Amino acid sequence: QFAKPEDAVKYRQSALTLMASHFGRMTPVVKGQAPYDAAQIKANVEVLKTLSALPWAAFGPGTEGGDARPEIWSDAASFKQKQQAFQDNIVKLSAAADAGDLDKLRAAFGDVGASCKACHDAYKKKK
Amino acid sequence: QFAKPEDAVKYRQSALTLMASHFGRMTPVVKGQAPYDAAQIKANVEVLKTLSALPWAAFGPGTEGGDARPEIWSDAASFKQKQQAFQDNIVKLSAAADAGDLDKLRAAFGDVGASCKACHDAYKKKK
Ligand code: HEC
Ligand code: HEC
């Protein structure tokens, strides 16, 4: 869907921004700093579900640019494992939210965050 | 969910970018330039459904900035009507996609586009 590589870069950066707001806005809830409303969190995690599937297709062939390391493309099966671990932890987070359990949510949120960081550390260029 | 107004600006700009890719990537299909696969379009319109609800909450109170006109806040019921017309045309687009009919899809796509432009012309700052 991208006319030039820069269009894929812009898309994935926007998707990751949006996805990252939906994740991070739950931090006060899982820390107990903000109240836990099970329906609110279930709806938010549904939005995060959708968003968390979107970035990866915008790292096609020859979309080098932005802060994406070239290793994303030359080590494709591996990058795919970092992405698939992350989305399987998103499935777990959905399960916790859908069930309405703050303990389970806390644990699942931590697992997702660890998977964000694992990919970050391997595949996002240094700042 | 925004620490500063600039965070709400960044969110809505990203949401609108992402939402706009999901809309515009269907243009070759509705023009007949690309093939029509009903299941592909149904899945894409589901993603657009989700995205099209996201920008508006990031125009809260005192999030002036970006290319948002101040009239968005001082004429709140009206802006809300531009937003609600747009999302009701997104409901129609979902219906067309879910039904699998290219004629209906074409018509519904045109209606959505007109609603994007109506809001653009009233509420996005001039370039
Ligand atoms: C788990 C919920 C997260 C969160 C919170 C973020 N990511 Fe990542 N990310 C990855 C790569 C390769 C990039 C660079 C993209 C590019 O510049 O081309 C990023 C970038 C980000 C950003 C910055 C976006 C921007 O506005 O420029 C942010 C806020 C962000 N990430 C947060 C790679 C990955 C992964 C590889 C499989 C995974 C998993 C994640 N990111 C997960 C998350
Ligand atoms: C219907 C599907 C669309 C499409 C394709 C776009 N919009 Fe809008 N838009 C609105 C406002 C106030 C802004 C400015 C936001 C800000 O800068 O603070 C925008 C901006 C955009 C962009 C640019 C995003 C960016 O990267 O900076 C794009 C690509 C875009 N729009 C496309 C307002 C509205 C509406 C008011 C109710 C509606 C409806 C739409 N936009 C609809 C669409």
Task: Give the CATH number, domain containing residue A43.
Answer: 1.20.120.10
- CA A102 to ligand 2 centroid distance, Å: 36
The count of domains in chain B is 1
| A1 lies within 8 A of chain B by CB | yes
**Are residues B58 and B83 in contact, defined by beta-carbon separation less than 8 angstroms?**
no
What is the DSSP secondary-structure string of chain B?
Answer: --SSHHHHHHHHHHHHHHHHHHHHTTHHHHTTSS---HHHHHHHHHHHHHHHTSGGGGS-TT---TTB-THHHHTHHHHHHHHHHHHHHHHHHHHHHHHT-HHHHHHHHHHHHHHHHHHHHHHBPP-
Alpha-carbon distance of A29 to A31, in angstroms, equals 5
* Experimental technique used to determine this entry: X-ray
Alpha-carbon distance of A63 to B113, in angstroms, equals 28
Resolution in Å, one decimal, please.
1.1
Give B 18-47 residues with CB within 8 A of chain A: 18, 21, 24-25, 47
Beta-bridged to residue B68, according to DSSP, are B124
Tokens read off for B70? 């101040």
Alpha-carbon distance of B69 to B122, in angstroms, equals 8
Q: Which domain holds residue B108?
A: 2-127
Alpha-carbon distance of B91 to B97, in angstroms, equals 10
Alpha-carbon distance of A14 to B55, in angstroms, equals 13
**DSSP 8-state assignment for residue A125:** P
Residue A124's SS3 state is: strand
Give first-to-last CA distance, chain B, whole Å. Answer: 29
Give the list of residues 6+ apart from residue B4 with CB closer than 8 angstroms, or none.
none
**Are residues B95 and B112 in contact, defined by beta-carbon separation less than 8 angstroms?**
no
* Cα-based angle B25, B29, B32 (whole degrees, multiple of 5): 145
The alpha carbons of chain B give a radius of gyration, in whole angstroms, of 15
Alpha-carbon distance of A53 to B71, in angstroms, equals 35
Phi/psi at B125 (5° precision): -60, 150
Give B 61-120 residues with CB within 8 A of chain A: none
B12 annotated ligand-binding residue: yes
